[PDB]
């Protein structure tokens, strides 16, 4: 009669997952933080020396938010006074501490309100962005070189992304790319001049008398998009006597005829750079390969070296075209490409040949290329057991494509089926991270023999704690819809009796290329719902979901709000007729796209669902950003796909909500999925006489992830779910 995993347990993080984060600094050494001390561990021996005492900055005068050590150990960058913006963006102050002098650098400092800072990949050069302009320090204590003079708040972005590039293209605030030895610094410039602003209120502390209106350039579907330009500067030719010369590389002519995006920047060599451009209609993209001209000092992009990639069934890549991995001589590269069967595999390219050669095949997909040597290509995939929600590390022999070895399938096959990898500087060593089904496990390995050196973190302490609590179980399996496997997972309450009938919560995301059914071990809200409240929490990956080929992924092409919605309903039907599900107690809930689908399902009139919770949902596609939306939907014009835009709104279905209980939650400072979207849902429900439950979260963004707010929303959702389920 042990305890349960309580809501309190989830919110207070009483049962912690340990990790092991390291930073490879060479081909056989890495940094770890242990008891606030930074240590360097040798990969071979496992011996360690102290790199930085925890006491070093216990006289700093500030709280230290983050740190970065220069690639040569000579300098440490100290981030303090941090203030968040978007998912990846912020501002802060930075100090630089000399590790040899064991002193703080007091002169020619990085200014306050700095937007981004990055070391060169070797040495200790700095590139930083302040007031939308790029600055470079060669030596940390000397004056900086101003690279750009065009920076302008909300208008011109040099070396940092605007909102939409940050969220939908680079998944990062930075738009700087150092050449491998830091000779060149490549960067993008974005122009949001004609991009409409989303505006919303921010209330801040009680003491603020008038709310602030936040204004963000944000292109909604069909709106005017930001413009982009690309430059390379030689950081070794910098001087205080002249202004820096940024050499522009123009996009290919196939892009310039219309709206386009810069979607990938990957250095090939010290003097070769690859760029991928993507048309606004995202089923056409081109790689450009550019060589430095040591005579002129410019960059030539041979037309013969262009590589066109284009889709006829949907968009290019999963979310964007894949990044190339170049051979050391940069004359050939490996890249993930969808094959004739619609499966994503590794293709081998010659920089001047159009046709590529597949080195992997099968009805499974390569997830990512992780490392490349003269002899071996290393990659993660879901080939093992045909489980698309599994991840293993493979190495393939370059001289013989039939010589593929699985480096993780066999290590701990019962405990570990979900792996990610971190390689040392020449792939001489690698750290493996097991994320489930068992407790996460972190191990060290050498690539030479694929010998396992040692265990870094095994999470024994948590295993010890979790023995005194009635933990739920996880079933991962599939069902068959007209000759196709569709995976689901169920979080099952302890002492599961399949003769009894349980209430079911459908946990849904269901966005294109999503995957909610996997082998990952998790300690979340669903754990509490099953452990304490005896609710079966289920997820289902239907049409539109990813890592199982384009027939499934491209199914919802130009018709979001259709198949992936239906399949969630059909999944609930299937679940109920398994016999352990109370068909009068099926709920559904989702965040963002999940909130959209949740709402679309609750207004389906299918009567399968009794209640539901939408958190920050999309309600209509023309409210969402251009890059994401148009990827799947095209333009909202009569000449294109306006019909499916208008057919797929939540508001359209307002009437059907009379049959269900509905909880609508949204943060007021959501710059991603604007509060607007929910405002339009609630308004349509009011206009039609449907009652529902609502809750705003003042000043919370798309994550609603501040400490207090996070506890509050989950607590509130708990009551709603327990109440719909007639639970005590």
């Amino acid at each position: 009669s042990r305890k349960t995993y309580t809501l309190t347990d989830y919110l207070k993080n009483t049962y912690r997952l340990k990790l092991y984060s390291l930073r490879w600094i060479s081909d056989h050494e890495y940094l770890y933080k242990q008891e606030n001390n930074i240590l360097v561990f040798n990969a071979e021996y496992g011996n360690s020396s102290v790199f930085l005492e925890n006491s070093t900055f216990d006289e700093f005068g500030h709280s230290i938010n983050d740190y970065s050590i220069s690639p040569d150990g000579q300098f440490i960058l100290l981030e303090y006074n941090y203030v968040k913006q978007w998912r990846h963006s912020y501002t802060a102050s930075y100090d630089i501490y000399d590790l040899n002098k064991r002193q703080l650098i007091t002169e020619e400092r990085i200014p306050n309100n700095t937007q981004w800072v990055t070391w060169s990949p070797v040495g200790h050069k700095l590139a930083y962005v302040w007031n939308n302009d790029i600055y470079v320090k060669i030596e940390p204590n000397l004056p900086s070189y101003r690279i750009t003079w065009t920076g302008k708040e909300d208008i011109i972005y040099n070396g940092i992304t605007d909102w939409v590039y940050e969220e939908e293209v680079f998944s990062a605030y930075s738009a700087l790319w150092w050449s491998p030895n830091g000779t060149f610094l490549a960067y993008a410039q974005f122009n949001d001049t004609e991009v409409p602003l989303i505006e919303y209120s921010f209330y801040s502390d009680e003491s603020l008398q008038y709310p602030k209106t936040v204004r963000v350039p944000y292109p909604k579907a069909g709106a005017v998009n930001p413009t982009v330009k690309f430059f390379v500067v030689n950081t070794d030719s910098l001087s205080s006597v002249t202004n820096a010369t940024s050499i522009q590389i123009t996009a290919p002519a196939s892009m310039l005829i219309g709206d386009h995006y810069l979607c990938d920047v990957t250095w090939a060599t010290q003097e070769r750079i690859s760029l991928q451009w993507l048309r606004r209609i995202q089923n056409y993209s081109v790689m450009d390969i550019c060589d430095y001209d040591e005579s002129s000092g410019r960059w030539n992009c041979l037309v013969a070296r262009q590589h066109i990639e284009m889709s006829t069934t949907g968009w290019v890549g999963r979310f964007r075209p894949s990044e190339p991995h170049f051979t050391l001589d940069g004359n050939s590269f490996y890249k993930i490409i969808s094959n004739e069967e619609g499966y994503r595999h590794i293709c081998y390219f010659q920089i001047d040949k159009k046709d590529c050669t597949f080195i992997t095949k099968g009805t499974w997909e390569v997830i990512g290329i992780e490392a490349l040597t003269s002899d071996y290509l290393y990659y993660i995939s879901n080939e093992y057991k045909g489980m698309p929600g599994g991840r293993n590390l493979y190495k393939i022999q370059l001289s013989d494509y039939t010589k593929v070895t699985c480096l993780s399938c066999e290590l701990n096959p019962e405990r570990c089926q979900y792996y990610s990898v971190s390689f040392s500087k020449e792939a001489k060593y690698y750290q493996l991270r097991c994320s489930g089904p068992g407790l996460p496990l972190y191990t060290l390995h050498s690539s030479v023999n694929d010998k396992g050196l040692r265990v870094l973190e095994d999470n024994s302490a948590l295993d010890k704690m979790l023995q005194n609590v009635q933990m739920p179980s996880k079933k991962l399996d599939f069902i068959i819809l007209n000759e196709t496997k569709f995976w689901y997972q169920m979080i099952l309450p302890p002492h599961f009796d399949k003769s009894k009938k349980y209430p079911l919560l459908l946990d849904v995301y269901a966005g294109p290329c999503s995957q909610k059914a996997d082998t990952v071990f998790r300690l979340n809200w669903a754990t509490y719902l099953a452990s304490t409240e005896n609710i079966i929490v289920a997820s289902f990956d239907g049409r539109g979901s990813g890592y199982q080929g384009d027939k499934i992924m491209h199914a919802i092409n130009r018709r979001l709000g259709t198949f992936e919605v239906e399949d969630q309903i059909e999944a609930a039907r299937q679940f109920s007729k398994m016999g352990f599900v109370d068909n009068k107690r099926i709920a559904i809930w989702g965040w963002s796209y999940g909130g959209y689908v949740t709402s679309m399902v609750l207004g389906s009139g299918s009567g399968v669902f009794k209640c539901g919770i939408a958190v920050a949902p999309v309600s209509r596609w023309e409210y969402y950003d251009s890059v994401y939306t148009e990827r799947y939907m095209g333009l909202p014009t009569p000449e294109d796909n306006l019909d499916h835009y208008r057919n797929s709104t939540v508001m359209s279905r307002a009437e059907n909500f009379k049959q269900v209980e509905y909880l609508l939650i949204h943060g007021t400072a959501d710059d991603n999925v604007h509060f607007q979207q929910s405002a339009q849902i609630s308004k349509a429900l009011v206009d039609v006489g449907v009652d529902f439950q609502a809750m705003w979260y003042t000043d919370e963004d798309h994550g609603i992830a501040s400490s207090t707010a996070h506890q509050h929303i989950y607590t509130h959702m708990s009551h709603f779910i327990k109440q719909c389920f007639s639970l005590p």
Partner: protein
């Protein structure tokens, strides 16, 4: 008699891709006169020398002038495959040529500066297949095919221009991209001279 360099001194030297051409038949030239007005930073010739090009008589002298920054000297070369020779300004290889880089002082005031220096960094056609890109290279003694779509001064570094082509013109598109260099204290110019030695018509001689 006496060669007329007039319209060079009066106004704004155009951009390299809009170079103005002065033709000289049947006259006397004091060129060391002209090059005494300016401050001269570089003088290289092909198939001739700067000494020789002052002395000899010719049947035809062509003077091309434009605004051009000293910073871009490595791109203004007879032996160069930069954007200048590709898309902006190309001299003949069959005649002897000279290339002069200069700086208008202050003393010279009838020569006005423009907002910035501009040049074409891309001029290509996109074929009617929407895939094939064909650079449009400039031929000697001609302007770029892109001068119809590139403004006389580029508004901002990296701007790009497009123009859909009529089925008669070949279909597909015409495409260009402009670059800028910041204007200098004293305006900086480029001069390209091309001489033709005639059989009997050597009526362009120096004067004494």
């Amino acid at each position: 008699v006496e060669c007329d360099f007039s319209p060079l001194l009066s106004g704004t030297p155009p951009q390299v891709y809009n170079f103005k051409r002065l033709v000289f038949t049947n006259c006397n030239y004091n060129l060391t006169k002209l090059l005494s007005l300016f401050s001269v930073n570089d003088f290289t010739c092909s198939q001739i020398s700067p000494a020789a090009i002052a002395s000899n008589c010719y049947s035809s002298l062509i003077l091309d002038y434009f605004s051009y920054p000293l910073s871009m000297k490595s791109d203004l070369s007879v032996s160069s495959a930069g954007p200048i020779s590709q898309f902006n300004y190309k001299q003949s290889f069959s005649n002897p040529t000279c290339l002069i880089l200069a700086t208008v002082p202050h003393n010279l005031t009838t020569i006005t500066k423009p907002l910035k220096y501009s040049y074409i960094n891309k001029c290509s056609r996109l074929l009617s297949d929407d895939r094939t890109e064909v650079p449009q290279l400039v031929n000697a003694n001609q302007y770029s095919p892109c001068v119809s779509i590139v403004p006389s001064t580029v508004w901002e570094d990296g701007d790009y221009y497009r123009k859909q082509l009529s089925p008669l013109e070949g279909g597909g598109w015409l495409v260009a991209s402009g670059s800028t260099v910041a204007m200098t204290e004293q305006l900086q110019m480029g001069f390209g001279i091309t001489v033709q030695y005639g059989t009997d018509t050597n009526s362009v001689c120096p004067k004494l």
